[PDB]
Amino acid sequence: IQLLIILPLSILIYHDFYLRLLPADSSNVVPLNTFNILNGVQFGTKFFQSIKSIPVGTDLPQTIDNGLSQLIPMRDNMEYKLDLNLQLYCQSKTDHLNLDNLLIDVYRGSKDEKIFHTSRPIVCLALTDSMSPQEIEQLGPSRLDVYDEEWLNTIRIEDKISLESSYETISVFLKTEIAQRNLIIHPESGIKFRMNFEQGLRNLMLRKRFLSYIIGISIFHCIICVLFFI
Amino acid sequence: IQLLIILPLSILIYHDFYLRLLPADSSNVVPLNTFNILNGVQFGTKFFQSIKSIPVGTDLPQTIDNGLSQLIPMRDNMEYKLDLNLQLYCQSKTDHLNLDNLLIDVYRGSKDEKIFHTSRPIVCLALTDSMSPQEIEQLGPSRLDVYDEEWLNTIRIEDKISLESSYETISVFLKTEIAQRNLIIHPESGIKFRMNFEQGLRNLMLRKRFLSYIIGISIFHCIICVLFFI
Amino acid sequence: IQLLIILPLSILIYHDFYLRLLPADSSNVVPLNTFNILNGVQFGTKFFQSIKSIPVGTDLPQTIDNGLSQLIPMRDNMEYKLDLNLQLYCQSKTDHLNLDNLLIDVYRGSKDEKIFHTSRPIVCLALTDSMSPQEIEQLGPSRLDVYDEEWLNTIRIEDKISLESSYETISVFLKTEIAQRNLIIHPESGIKFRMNFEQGLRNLMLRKRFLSYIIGISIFHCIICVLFFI
């Protein structure tokens, strides 16, 4: 097994190539905890946060995942793509309708213009719902693990929202169209701001960072093996 | 089996290296029993405790796990990272909503400034919940073992709260946003205060003490074997 | 099988060594039956017993396990560590909340100063709880065996309470913070008073008497075998 000592020399150079081609400041994950929350009844919940624009050569800071309201940093003359990663629990307070429709509306700063709308059917927990002991044995003994693997509504929206730093505010509206529910947003829910590169492949690599490392470390094995043949 | 008598000589030297590089006073676990408890209805429960600052060369004492209110000792000119280890049982008194959201708020001593906020979905015990005999056979015969492995809500927050000894008081707020519940905090719940070292690897070793010993005693086997080859 | 006749000569000498190094009067188990019981509603149940101090060379008596109120004998100028072994059944009289929190408070004789506080989550029997025939087959046919293996709340607190013989009275408070329950204390529940030796290893051997015999009789096998080699 001589492949174990040479694979670090491949992963290090691939990591250096990835950071050279995709800088670390090209993507920013902004959790919804860092937004401002406005709860209503005719619009659901509102996730609005102002945008701060910094000039070139200013070392774009990252968003601290501390749950505090922070301005979203974006490069001034740059166009960003938004990846909405939303995980939430729906809990029926009334009418116990087990399946509902979640309305997702994205606005930007003549008051606010809507730039994205979508619907996602979501399963909602009812008081009559019970958890069988078969699910405990298979889906992990922990009740929270069973709820996460069974009732957690995961909503991913990538490469569909375009935002410019010239706009001052961005708002996200979440509403259920059938009945009022208790929406528990998972703390890992957030919006990832990606720089939209014109090379095409870089945008795909940003969206698939985990898959990109696997493909890169599997495709450098031919470079590793070609020096063996010579 | 000649490896059994030489492994103590490796674990002893690795322990000496660990204590030389990470002193025993670099981390302090302060259980929530040693805080002051203030129970409300508009903020939940409050875990506040004053800070005592001692000068250099004063032999930082540890926190006695006796459940008595003790001041938190921190070095004067040192910045500490807080690891919140929180285990608790949620028990529904009313409305028997099986899943709730726990709000964790951390303050510090112009009255109090919030330095951390987060949410954690938690499972709550209801009166209709029953424990199947299948869970008794698999998750240990003891009822408390089944509750610990099934209903205990474990919340770990590491490397996200930064505290300075210049501040006098630190507060921790726990609240459920949906309904009022009976929160039974596990006696092992507490906050671990770690010194933030600038070397980077030392901070990682403090956070992963159990894993660090395993890696160290597995990586010294090459030093053990190299003297065999010579 | 010649090891069967020589192992008594090893266990006898190890027992003699244990009694020479740890005298028989170095530990005293005082069951809670021998305390005085005061039942309240704002403090739960109170386990208070006065201390008798005898001078040196007085042959410290043991506590008779007869359920009668007896003074606790401790050496005059000696510091004792308390090991609280508490087994109890919780039975819900009202509100049938299946899980509760037990508050343990230890005082000593300006009226009484608290020296230890802790909480232990305990499972409580409800009237709706039923015992499946599967548990009868596996956890012993006897109903009391199933309750002991399933519902008995075992609370062990060792090496956390320090008491001096200069104090006259020691009190133990047991209370459930959620609801009033019927606490049935197991007759074997009690407090073990250990002498705190400065050698460190003796304190560990007192706390692990059963494990200490096993380790000692397994470590004297090398002394047994070394005379075979010579």
Residue numbers in the entry:
A (entry chain J), B (entry chain A), C (entry chain B): 24 to 132, 145 to 265
Per the authors:
We show that Sei1 forms a homodecameric ring that scaffolds and positions Ldb16, with the latter emerging as the primary TAG binder via specific hydroxyl-containing residues, as proposed for human Seipin. Thus, we propose that LD assembly by the Sei1/Ldb16 complex, and likely other Seipins, requires sequential triacylglycerol-concentrating steps via distinct elements in the ER membrane and lumen.
The structure of Sei1 was determined to a resolution of 2.7 Å. The Seipin ring is assembled from 10 Sei1 protomers with a diameter of 140 Å in the outer and 25 Å in the inner rings. Although the two TM segments are encoded by amino acids at the very N- and C-terminal of Sei1 sequence, they come into close proximity and show extensive interactions in the folded polypeptide. Proximal to the luminal face of the membrane, Y37/Y41 establish methionine-aromatic interactions with a methionine residue (M240) in a short helix (α3) in between the luminal β-sandwich and the TM region, hereafter called locking helix (LH). Furthermore, the Sei1 α1/ α2 region is enriched in charged residues.
